[PDB]
């Protein structure tokens, strides 16, 4: 047998391919499970670990988003930006992005710590990456976020139905 969530994911994929956006969104809302399509989960983890956050942010924009994983990921990307001394970009991301606004609202202290870190004239990596390494943070973020995402072949439902027709045609159905 197969889990309902998987079948609903197949349906949602079909809806996406058939350009039925409204029914797709309404479905995802009602059943509270969302399709999160990626070419490869390993490739996704690779993208997160390597440090290519433009792509990762693209994928993030594509999928259904939890606020917590968002504020975590965006926080880490903020620290990565302030490390590379892209102060303007980091401040703009911290100010003008939705998960960062949510973080600012819910926890003023955390946002204050991030802004304080950005305001510093130099990047003090010893303590922040001393407590937990960059590689480890990237690793846990990649793991938790990737476990949320799924991988499914294009027109999976149709192919499956084709297999069903092949079954009926060449093997046959049960007599009663």
């Amino acid at each position: 047998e197969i889990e309902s969530s998987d079948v609903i994911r197949l349906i949602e994929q079909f809806l996406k391919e058939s350009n039925l956006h409204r029914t797709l969104a309404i479905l995802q809302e009602e059943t509270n499970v969302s399709l999160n399509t990626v070419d490869s989960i390993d490739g996704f983890c690779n993208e997160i670990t390597s440090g290519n956050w433009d792509n990762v942010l693209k994928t993030v924009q594509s999928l259904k988003l939890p606020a917590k994983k968002l504020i975590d990921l965006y926080e880490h990307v903020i620290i990565e930006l302030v490390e590379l001394r892209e102060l303007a970009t980091a401040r703009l991301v911290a100010r003008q992005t939705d998960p960062m606004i949510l973080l600012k609202q819910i926890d003023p202290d955390r946002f204050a710590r991030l802004e304080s870190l950005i305001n510093r004239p130099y990047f003090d990596g010893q303590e922040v990456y001393g407590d937990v390494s960059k590689e480890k943070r990237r690793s846990v973020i990649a793991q938790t976020l990737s476990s949320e995402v799924h991988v499914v072949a294009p027109s999976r439902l149709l192919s499956l139905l084709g297999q069903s027709l092949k079954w009926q045609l060449h093997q046959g159905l049960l007599p009663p």
Binding site: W53, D54, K58, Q61, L84, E86, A88, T89, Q96, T97
Partner: peptide, 18 residues
């Protein structure tokens, strides 16, 4: 309206601000 330093920076800026 897009400050371009690193390629990943200008691209992430492109994505987040559009």
């Amino acid at each position: 309206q897009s400050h371009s330093e690193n390629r990943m920076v200008r691209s992430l800026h492109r994505v987040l601000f559009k």
